[PDB]
Amino acid sequence: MAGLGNVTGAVASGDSLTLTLDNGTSASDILELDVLSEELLRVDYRPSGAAPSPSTPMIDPDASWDAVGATIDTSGDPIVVTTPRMRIEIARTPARMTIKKADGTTLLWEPASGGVFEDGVRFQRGSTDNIYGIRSFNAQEDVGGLLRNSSDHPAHAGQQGDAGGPFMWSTAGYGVLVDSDGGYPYTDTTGKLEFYYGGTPTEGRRYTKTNVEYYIMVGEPKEIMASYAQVTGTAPMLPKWSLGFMNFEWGIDQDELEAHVDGYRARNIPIDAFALDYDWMDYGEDNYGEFRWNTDNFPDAATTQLKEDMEAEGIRLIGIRKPRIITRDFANQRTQQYYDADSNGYFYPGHNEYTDYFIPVTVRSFDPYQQASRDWWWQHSIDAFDKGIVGWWNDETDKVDSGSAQYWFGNFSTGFTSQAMYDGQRDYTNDGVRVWQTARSYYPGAQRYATTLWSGDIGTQFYKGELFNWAPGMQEQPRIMLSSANLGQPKWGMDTGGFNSLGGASGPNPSPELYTRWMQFGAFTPVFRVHGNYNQQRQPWLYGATAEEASKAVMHTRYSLLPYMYAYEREASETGLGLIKPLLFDYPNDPQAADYTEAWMFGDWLLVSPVLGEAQHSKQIYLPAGTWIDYHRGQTYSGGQTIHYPVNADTWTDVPLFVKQGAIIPNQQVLDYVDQQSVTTVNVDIFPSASETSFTYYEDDGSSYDYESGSSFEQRLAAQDLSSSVRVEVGAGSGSYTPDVQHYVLKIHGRAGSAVTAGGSALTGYGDLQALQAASGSGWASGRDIYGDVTYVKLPAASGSATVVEVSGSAPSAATHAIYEVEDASRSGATPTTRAGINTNHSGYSGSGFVDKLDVPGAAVTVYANAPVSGDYPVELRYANGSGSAKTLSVYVNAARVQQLSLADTGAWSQWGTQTTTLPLTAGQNIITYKYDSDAGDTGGVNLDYIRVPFAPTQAEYAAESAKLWGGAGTSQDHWFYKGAAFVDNLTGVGAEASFDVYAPSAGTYNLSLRYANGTGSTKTLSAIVNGGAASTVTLTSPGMNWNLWNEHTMTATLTAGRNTISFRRNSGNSGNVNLDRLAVSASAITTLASERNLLDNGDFERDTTYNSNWTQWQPSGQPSAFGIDSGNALHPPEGPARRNQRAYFHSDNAYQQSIHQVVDVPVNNATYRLEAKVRMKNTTPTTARAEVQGHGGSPIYANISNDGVWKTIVIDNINVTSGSVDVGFYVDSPGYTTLHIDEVTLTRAP
Amino acid sequence: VGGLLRNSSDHPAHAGQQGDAGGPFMWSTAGYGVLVDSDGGYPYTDTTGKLEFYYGGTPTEGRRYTKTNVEYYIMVGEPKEIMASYAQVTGTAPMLPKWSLGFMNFEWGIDQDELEAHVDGYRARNIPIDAFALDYDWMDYGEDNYGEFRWNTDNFPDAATTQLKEDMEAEGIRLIGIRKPRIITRDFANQRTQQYYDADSNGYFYPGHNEYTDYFIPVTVRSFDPYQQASRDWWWQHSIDAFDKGIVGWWNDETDKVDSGSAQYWFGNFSTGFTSQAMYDGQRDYTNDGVRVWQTARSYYPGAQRYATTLWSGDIGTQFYKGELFNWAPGMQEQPRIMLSSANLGQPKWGMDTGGFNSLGGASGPNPSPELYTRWMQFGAFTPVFRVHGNYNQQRQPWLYGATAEEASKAVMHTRYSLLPYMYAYEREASETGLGLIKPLLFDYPNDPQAADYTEAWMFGDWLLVSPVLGEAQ
């Protein structure tokens, strides 16, 4: 903010004066004065004499003046420039300009304190001078006058009729013009006249200048304005017709235009032009519609006829133009104009796609408060109801928001709108079709008219402020749901996936992660629904195989629970209490339940706590008083504590779900929809408590209000754990509805009885659940499941009298495996009529049948199998192959392709064999799929009978990142070659630790293997603490100064049956400073885990793209990279990953070559390896697109990728590695607009 | 989004909007509840132990049920008992169809072919689903004859009959349809609708809610960059056909700022000049300097005048002055100050929407009165770019405003057109000095304090001083 220094040199030449100014350096400042006319001076200040920047488009590039012949006198102090109209004085010490009229009258001057400087100009002038220019006023502003005597408004073009610029002038005889892209003029009534470049203005700044170029005008206003036009340009003459009257109009076609023109002409009212708004053009359409005449409105503009006919009537035509293009037509297709603009870089910088509206309609709110209004509303809805609208999604019964229209609906508007449909539909159908509605507000009483509540236009984000601050996201929704429950509206839902994004409907869809977690959450809420903004899609398969399979899996859980859930729908008709409730309902006196919203009750007997955090590796879950059983993993927890709950961030398969001891949970086979068939057997899972508990099973027609006059069915089920037996009562049937249920299968957990009695009779024992299910009439059986010992009891439902069953004794099963009959499992395929099938037409099968039709591409069967801990499970597949030769099927686990199974001929279709494969299962639910994947080279063509899954793994694994971290230990992805989603780092402070919860079947000595990195260069130590016992030293050598190298530390530990704690901690004697990845646990020697076969780093591209990986890239010198990694969720529709959250892409709009490569040293040289990957190609066919294996000892091996649009598996087998390393890669040569996606790349040791 | 606790609450009891819920219901896990019968109002709690509820003043949402008595309910029990007693007083919930426990796919942007494809995709994969909900897509919203209640058979051909319902039912799919508590009162062709006549004659509109202009058909757009020569060449190239077929003047709107939902993008200060340059350079090249360029824009920055553009004052109000009918846009009386401010910045080629653009209720709001229209026309005739404009489907022909508006408009128009050779000399002057057809008095009288901020009269060329009557009933 300092002024210029002393003049140290002055060089006159013609009409120019060049001053050198002292700034205390060898690169002195330069001030160039040029006398352009007798009354116009140009000044160019160049800090340190640097070359001037280009002038902005303010300046006329062709401006030209005659020689003035000014007198420049540098002989004294001040230096003096004179013309007949002005006298410019520059004082030497320091340099300050004074501008005067030729007669010596002072106009303006640079004050002592400072004039021109690096960021602007500063003048002083008469305090009473009137200043003009700078700014005008827009159509949304208070409109001031002409005077600018106390102004700090910026210089800008502005909006809505505004005008402005760096031009300040006075009627006292001077003007100042500064070349600038925006900036900040300043005036006040002490006499300041200043202009600052300042910070980037609101409108942006695309022309920056290091010099300060300005112009000083002397004269009367007309002379000042003429000088302004000399500098910035005069105006070209408009056509003479433009002095005439013009009629601008919006809402006009050719007939109306002709009528208007006739109207003027008939009346001798002169007029020269009509201006046509949107009407004239095909705005919204492809092929440059926003430049094309709309021949529906103006038929004669198909040719020059309209122009010529209007010209003959003396009418010229003006057309509205918007500085934008339509990037999606009315059918949601990318337009030609989009492709052209996008490929050439013609979009305004910083301006993304957005939603416009240009077709107005006029509307007015109806009043639902009036009975006659409600009758009318209903009467006009009957036709839509008859033709299929059987649920009413009543939107915007709350508030209008449109321009000046900001109207509120009253508090009873939702209730009354709901009443209109409720009363109407009930009368019209004679109470024969139940009403379903949703609204986005609730007020007491509205519930009488059969309406749910949804949470409105929530944001597509994890939480409020993650991506934008103006709407809450997923994490807030439990608090909204439970607040609604606390107001007596438990029938609640949300837009799963979110509605709003940055950029409106064109903004991004949820990431696959956000989508998957939101679906798991929504499945345990009352009104389970996806929604999105205009032309957004929310189908689960669009978000990749994890989202698809995890969403499917949790939906199967929800539908299996239909009989459980439906009792709560009945309960809401009696007490208003519904399917969800906050913990505080059950625990009014528990302070940790008082505000608790991260978990809630789903019915009376299940506590759910969905994983809602991005990249979440574990959860802290408050369990209130009682005993809780993990639904998916089987272990028990005592209540009244916060538990640490490991989750697998790699698979997304966990939905933390806990059975409340006392639970009686009716459940059934999974249907595609609620009345797809009659369910004649209802399972009842019972977890007995020492106090009696009960659940009243309920059926009715699901459809009418017949239940109101007694047409329903119920049976009270009750249970109690006694000193040495369990008693279960199935009460007498009650009510007039004949239920579909014929038998209950009681699954009584916690005891495998030696006898089951009822009414003086010991029930007939059967060998297993299958034999019991096949028996007519009552019986029992026993077994083992994930929870432990279980007793099965099959009984008739709907008896007129109560049945009391008692399970006594203890005779635990010796079974080592669970059996899953695949005919009971999930059958899918490419189309609804090409799904895998059920059959019985060959003998020798277990259970009720086997699965066939695995001989059309895409046919599959999926089993949901629970595991107590993560690890290796050898899973046996029973199958038949009477084809004459071996056949292949893919086995997928948690959406990853684990192996191609080669299934040998079994000699005949009625002869069965078994294939056992070690599967990497995760703790809790696992998704095991056997599929005919023709695009991976499978043949299909076998029949499958069942799988057998061991209750215990051969060896277990526990991820460090999911362990309980303390003392500064954290998770990270900032080094290479970790397993799972992350590793543990920052074991630096004393007390830093990772504590694992390890499960053992029996007391004894177990082997441990701890995967760790130590890149310090020297041996480091931690302590191992088992079950809080004495610390033992863990000594961890360093393989060198490289944090991408991992090793195993082996040791043993003495464990007890059940849960053990094993902590690795920096105690005060220890050095720490290692990273931990995984703890493996076995009774035998530990070998490579099935989950850890992949030799590549970041082969699945799942790493946060802030962090790098062992992948490298290449493109031709001079070409921009065509490669990146993201989720594909910004696209409409999404182009998702093959698995989990992310995939690599190659894409450019113009011709390109691109590769990525990764080199790894193999563990065993002179051995065979195998590359597998998922690849998808779309859009333009490239010249070359391939996977590549090279550097292995042999010549390059190629596998081509062909343009389809679908994910395919590419395999390069039999890689004979003799060099000790392999380069795997992907390469594309494209003429332009080829998209390749790459995901799930694995390099493994192959037999 | 807060928590569940309401220990220090003064938020009103209302239905609210956008997923909200509320009511005069305040209860505790300490063993009691209070329910007050009320239409809105003001519950109050604090940590000194207050549990209060006030009817108070009329809330934001209105109040249509007022009460002189105070009716309330006290509940005693554990939370489930309190909630059961709440349901006794305010009602239990009717059982919903059993299919509503299933998964539902809601969707906006869907027709029959896509719905069938979605359902097939779920069924093929054994992903359970019971219902699809259809947005605007399902109905003829915007059309006459109760279009906002009627199936859209362009999107859903089989909903001409019960066929769609029955085929979807066969696949285990129930259909939900979106409803808006409003009717279209003017269809796409600007005709009053049957549903308007029926609602209006029976008094079925929400009290206090006047009709208003709304939009429902989205389009996706993106701003072009006029700063780049290649972009300007492209923009002009695609304009040639329109020009050949009669668009000889370029009304360049919205070169200033985008305003759409979250999209609030500014164009830079040279956007008007460069947009203008695209058409100017292009048209001059294409016609070999044979056809003069005419343009208008709604912003100005120095230098833009080189490319043959005028300036108009934007979406001004149909009113005499700012705050006459509404406060959010200026009216007629402010316009001379805007015109003369533009002149002081070297852009004297200025115009305005004579008649005004904006009204209360948007496009469906009132036209100018005959008086406003007549005076505005007289004013406009002594300004440089003389033009009427109005909002969507509004009309500005002078004969629609009665014989005084017609005859007085005609008369002043005859004066303007008689002055063509006077005016045209000033058009030539602007090519030499930038000075145009209008100027404030202070250009001629720089030392007169009475002229220093004077805008109620101005010079029309050098030799005429004009002072239009702009006051109502003046």
Ligand SMILES: OC[C@H]1O[C@H](O[C@H]2[C@H](O)[C@@H](O)[C@@H](O[C@H]3[C@H](O)[C@@H](O)[C@@H](O[C@H]4[C@H](O)[C@@H](O)[C@@H](O[C@H]5[C@H](O)[C@@H](O)[C@@H](O)O[C@@H]5CO)O[C@@H]4CO)O[C@@H]3CO)O[C@@H]2CO)[C@H](O)[C@@H](O)[C@@H]1O
């Ligand atoms: O004497 C009575 C008078 O006093 C008070 O005003 C005086 C100020 O308090 C005082 O600071 C001084 O103001 C100077 C200022 O110090 C100086 O920096 C300059 O201000 C420029 C910025 O330098 C320039 O960057 C630009 O600022 C932009 C900014 O870049 C942009 O990022 C954004 O934030 O907007 C800003 C503009 O709003 O422009 C400003 C000028 O607007 O010059 C100032 C004026 O010389 O002197 C003031 C009196 O002269 C009282 O407040 C005032 O009412 C009384 O009349």
Ligand SMILES: OC[C@H]1O[C@H](OC[C@H]2O[C@H](O[C@H]3[C@H](O)[C@@H](O)[C@@H](O[C@H]4[C@H](O)[C@@H](O)[C@H](O)O[C@@H]4CO)O[C@@H]3CO)[C@H](O)[C@@H](O)[C@@H]2O)[C@H](O)[C@@H](O)[C@@H]1O
């Ligand atoms: O690499 C240069 C590239 O960077 C930016 O885009 C990165 C983007 O690239 C890929 O997206 C492609 C799709 O794969 C193509 O299918 C195509 O998508 C369009 C699709 O064909 C239409 O049907 C759909 O409705 O609209 C989309 C366009 O929105 O084009 C996009 C590129 O725009 C890749 O799959 C993505 O993961 C990745 O984010 C930059 O935006 C590009 O302009 C640039 O070329």
Ligand SMILES: OC[C@H]1O[C@H](O[C@H]2[C@H](O)[C@@H](O)[C@@H](O[C@H]3[C@H](O)[C@@H](O)[C@@H](O[C@H]4[C@H](O)[C@@H](O)[C@@H](O)O[C@@H]4CO)O[C@@H]3CO)O[C@@H]2CO)[C@H](O)[C@@H](O)[C@@H]1O
């Ligand atoms: O952890 C955060 C870091 O993340 C990124 O680091 C990457 C690098 O980009 C890779 O180059 C590689 O680094 C290796 C390195 O290649 C290897 O030579 C070795 O480096 C030693 C070095 O030999 C030794 O003399 C001394 O300088 O220490 C180095 C390391 O401690 O080992 C590196 C790995 O440890 O992989 C890492 C990720 O592990 C990012 O680029 C870094 O800026 C960032 O710090």
Ligand SMILES: OC[C@H]1O[C@H](O[C@H]2[C@H](O)[C@@H](O)[C@@H](O[C@H]3[C@H](O)[C@@H](O)[C@@H](O[C@H]4[C@H](O)[C@@H](O)[C@@H](O)O[C@@H]4CO)O[C@@H]3CO)O[C@@H]2CO)[C@H](O)[C@@H](O)[C@@H]1O
């Ligand atoms: O104990 C702490 C506080 O106690 C005191 O506040 C009192 C007020 O004095 C009472 O008047 C009352 O406030 C009510 C008010 O009576 C009632 O009308 C309503 O106010 C509405 C208003 O009607 C409406 O038009 C709009 O303006 O919003 C208002 C609500 O914000 O509701 C009020 C309660 O919220 O009760 C309170 C609390 O007992 C004391 O004055 C405070 O300073 C003190 O902090």
Ligand SMILES: OC[C@H]1O[C@H](OC[C@H]2O[C@H](O)[C@H](O)[C@@H](O)[C@@H]2O)[C@H](O)[C@@H](O)[C@@H]1O
């Ligand atoms: O492809 C495996 C398949 O082989 C036999 O069936 C062949 C063929 O028989 C009928 O035509 C069926 O309708 C088709 O679906 C079959 O492809 C075995 O009988 C069958 O069990 C096995 O799955």
Ligand SMILES: OC[C@H]1O[C@@H](O)[C@H](O)[C@@H](O)[C@@H]1O
């Ligand atoms: O009808 C279009 C949109 O309108 C909004 O008011 C609703 O809240 C959305 O659910 C709906 O998709």
Ligand SMILES: OC[C@H]1O[C@@H](O)[C@H](O)[C@@H](O)[C@@H]1O
């Ligand atoms: O195109 C519709 C309307 O768009 C607005 O941005 C313009 O300012 C109006 O003059 C025009 O009638």
Ligand SMILES: OC[C@H]1O[C@H](O)[C@H](O)[C@@H](O)[C@@H]1O
């Ligand atoms: O000191 C130990 C730490 O050293 C380095 O910062 C490593 O990047 C980190 O992984 C490790 O935890």
Ligand SMILES: [Ca+2]
């Ligand atoms: Ca079987």
Ligand SMILES: [Ca+2]
């Ligand atoms: Ca790990």
Ligand SMILES: [Ca+2]
């Ligand atoms: Ca991936």
Ligand SMILES: [Mg+2]
């Ligand atoms: Mg010269």
Ligand SMILES: [Mg+2]
């Ligand atoms: Mg003064």
Ligand SMILES: [Mg+2]
């Ligand atoms: Mg600078």
Ligand SMILES: [Mg+2]
């Ligand atoms: Mg019209």
Ligand SMILES: [Mg+2]
């Ligand atoms: Mg005619």
